[PDB]
Amino acid sequence: METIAKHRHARSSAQKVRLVADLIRGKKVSQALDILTYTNKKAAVLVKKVLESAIANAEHNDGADIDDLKVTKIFVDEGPSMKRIMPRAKGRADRILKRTSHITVVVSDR
Amino acid sequence: AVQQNKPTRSKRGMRRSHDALTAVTSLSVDKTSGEKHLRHHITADGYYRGRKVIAK
Amino acid sequence: ARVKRGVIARARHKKILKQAKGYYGARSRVYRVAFQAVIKAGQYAYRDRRQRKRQFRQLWIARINAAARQNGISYSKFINGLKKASVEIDRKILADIAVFDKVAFTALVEKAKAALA
Amino acid sequence: MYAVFQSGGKQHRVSEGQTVRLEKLDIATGETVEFAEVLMIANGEEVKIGVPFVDGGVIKAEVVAHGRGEKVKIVKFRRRKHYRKQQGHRQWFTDVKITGISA
Amino acid sequence: MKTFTAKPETVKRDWYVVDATGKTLGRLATELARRLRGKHKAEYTPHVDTGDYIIVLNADKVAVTGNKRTDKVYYHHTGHIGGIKQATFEEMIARRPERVIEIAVKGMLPKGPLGRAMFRKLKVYAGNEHNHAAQQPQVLDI
RNA sequence: UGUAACGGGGCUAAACCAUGCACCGAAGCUGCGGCAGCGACGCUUAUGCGUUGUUGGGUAGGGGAGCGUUCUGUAAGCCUG
RNA sequence: CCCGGCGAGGGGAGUGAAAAAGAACCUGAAACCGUGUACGUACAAGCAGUGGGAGCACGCUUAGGCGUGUGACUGCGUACC
């Protein structure tokens, strides 16, 4: 049993989410429930909501148990950016590039 | 000044060990609380010394 | 009608960047840096074509002079005394017994003294 | 037997059943040849002759492969007084297996 | 083409020592560099070193006395700007007899990482006593 | 500025003179095997391969010998799900 | 229809040859972001490369002398329109 779930156009920069991705990836497949609820920064609570939705999409698909599952892949890709403007002295302006990301998680019983 | 070349992927060294943190070794389990709690400290349902001392 | 350059599009950048493998940083990504590094790689392969020969002599003589000085004589006096004998020399390519056989070397030093005073 | 001989102005060492690459011999595969310019010969002991070349010596060989060799690139450059002209460079080989060595 | 080459890797050493009594500090170091590189025992050289250990034990017993002994300069930069030290051959044998050859032989070892690999074998002693009394260094003779 | 007026180790020869042979020394000169042209030849063909003579730095510039693109005709064709 | 904040986004369900054609709606190499397995590797001096080549994997074949990748060791090495 394998479930793959993605969350797209998410309101965070992909590189900032890729800091928490390496803390959850690998490490004897034992970082979810171990530190995921207790990890700092706004990126960690985003990937936790995606992971708890991915295992709920496994219970939607087959049977009543999900206790054999672990995370096997966790990656994040760059969403389509928005060129905004904010004026300055004269001006002149700030670039204020607004960004998004696409998060993908895989959960498996193997 | 600007980055004239992309660094060898090892040079993030002592930032890479801080890029995501719990900053604690390693949080404790309690018999009447769901989420784990800090050493010498209160749980997310108000338990301290095995007894409930505050309400949420 | 127009030619639109499709006959050669991307093909010049390919021809250099396929030769840019393993080169450090910009040399394996930036065609202007890679082209310059490939002409310099061509210079060193051109110099090998015109310098390689020298290192074969440097193997031959180094084993002769060391073994001849272990026999009490200099290479310059050995090779001259061996040419003074007429023939029996087999050229500098075959002096390898200086690191492969003791008896064949002492018999070659005896031949390098046969015609001397 | 182990021998050394002259072929195409180049010297070659051969033991029975060994193979050597010469320059262009137009007769191609399966044809046989015989060489007489043998310099030294041995049975594990060399004849150690006090003269150039072996009397009555012959080496027997058969063609096993032939043709034009792999191309070498030759280019003539100069900086700031500009030229870059290319010269073509290909040569020919014939690969022959030794069937016998006698003297 | 890739025509195979036979690479040795295994080595065992029996330990030798050379006498400095009545010899010049210049040519003693030139002969010691030649013996460390192995060009008295092994051929080609500097490549594929299969040699044996060769050291000095009586390095203080070198020659030249009563004239040209209060001589030479041995200039050295300490690492503190223009800060420089100087010596004489008399002072060097009187208080630095193991180091005066050590600072001069490294300048005649092979270039690159092989220089360090030969320098690690040098191990010079003075006063006729070493830390190798169970190895044990025997006299190098012709 | 920091050895600072043998490259450097170091040196009464390893300094300096001229003298004799050896040795290392380039793509030079020669040999061996080829390339590109041309005067003269030899052996031979889905036609070129050897032999000999003779030459082979080149930007400014002059003058030649080939490769390639797209389009109209050939195309009332040919390739094609 | 499922999770979620009757959010947003995905994930099922239904249509199609194909929705990796699903609204930002056909096709498409890259600079920037990022992958796992093999191979080498934890003191080291210079335009960052080049010729030879042990070891190992990968490929194939009497494995037997030669392909795809990496790389110990080693001769050569102060950018350019």
Swiss-Prot record, chain A:
Part of the 50S ribosomal subunit. In TnaC-stalled ribosomes forms part of the binding pocket for L-Trp with the leader peptide and uL4. Keywords: Antibiotic resistance, Ribonucleoprotein, Ribosomal protein, RNA-binding, rRNA-binding. The keyword Metal-binding does not apply. Changing residue 91 to A/D/S: Abolishes translation elongation arrest of SecM. One of its GO terms (molecular function) is structural constituent of ribosome. This is Large ribosomal subunit protein uL22. Belongs to the universal ribosomal protein uL22 family. L-tryptophan binds at residue 90. One of its GO terms (biological process) is ribosome assembly. This protein binds specifically to 23S rRNA; its binding is stimulated by other ribosomal proteins, e.g. uL4, bL17, and bL20. It is important during the early stages of 50S assembly. It makes multiple contacts with different domains of the 23S rRNA in the assembled 50S subunit and ribosome. The wild-type allele (erythromycin sensitive) is dominant over the resistant allele, and is also dominant over the temperature-sensitive allele at both low and high temperatures. It holds the Pfam family Ribosomal_L22. Disulfide bonds: none annotated. InterPro entries: Ribosomal_uL22, Ribosomal_uL22_bac/chlpt-type, Ribosomal_uL22_bac/org-type, Ribosomal_uL22_CS, Ribosomal_uL22_sf. CDD domains: Ribosomal_L22. Changing residue 8 to C: In strain: SK1048; decreases translational rate, tRNA binding and subunit association at 44 degrees Celsius; does not alter 23S rRNA or uL4 interactions; not erythromycin resistant. It comes from Escherichia coli (strain K12).
Swiss-Prot record, chain B:
The keyword Ribonucleoprotein applies. It comes from the Bacteria. The keyword Ribosomal protein applies. InterPro entries: Ribosomal_bL32, Ribosomal_bL32_bact, Ribosomal_zn-bd. GO terms for biological process: cytoplasmic translation; response to radiation; response to reactive oxygen species; ribosomal large subunit assembly. Residues 1-37 are annotated as: Disordered. GO terms for cellular component: cytoplasm; cytosol; cytosolic large ribosomal subunit. Keywords: Ribonucleoprotein, Ribosomal protein. GO terms for molecular function: structural constituent of ribosome. Part of the 50S ribosomal subunit. Contacts L17. PANTHER family: 50S RIBOSOMAL PROTEIN L32 (PTHR35534), LARGE RIBOSOMAL SUBUNIT PROTEIN BL32 (PTHR35534:SF1). Belongs to the bacterial ribosomal protein bL32 family. This is Large ribosomal subunit protein bL32. It comes from Escherichia coli (strain K12).
From Swiss-Prot, chain C:
Keywords: Ribonucleoprotein, Ribosomal protein, RNA-binding, rRNA-binding. Signal peptide: none annotated. The keyword Ribonucleoprotein applies. GO terms for molecular function: large ribosomal subunit rRNA binding; mRNA binding; mRNA regulatory element binding translation repressor activity; structural constituent of ribosome. GO terms for biological process: cytoplasmic translation; ribosomal large subunit assembly. The keyword Ribonucleoprotein applies. Pfam families: Ribosomal_L20 (PF00453). One of its GO terms (cellular component) is cytosol. Gene3D superfamilies: 6.10.160.10, Ribosomal protein L20. Part of the 50S ribosomal subunit. Contacts L21. HAMAP family: Ribosomal_bL20. One of the primary rRNA binding proteins, it binds close to the 5'-end of the 23S rRNA. It is important during the early stages of 50S assembly. Belongs to the bacterial ribosomal protein bL20 family. This is Large ribosomal subunit protein bL20.
UniProtKB/Swiss-Prot annotation, chain E:
It comes from the Bacteria. Keywords: Ribonucleoprotein, Ribosomal protein. PROSITE patterns: RIBOSOMAL_L13. GO terms for cellular component: cytoplasm; cytosol; cytosolic large ribosomal subunit; ribosome. SUPFAM superfamilies: Ribosomal protein L13. One of its GO terms (molecular function) is large ribosomal subunit rRNA binding. InterPro entries: Ribosomal_uL13, Ribosomal_uL13_bac-type, Ribosomal_uL13_CS, Ribosomal_uL13_sf. CDD domains: Ribosomal_L13. Belongs to the universal ribosomal protein uL13 family. This protein is one of the early assembly proteins of the 50S ribosomal subunit, although it is not seen to bind rRNA by itself. It is important during the early stages of 50S assembly. Part of the 50S ribosomal subunit. This is Large ribosomal subunit protein uL13. It comes from Escherichia coli (strain K12).
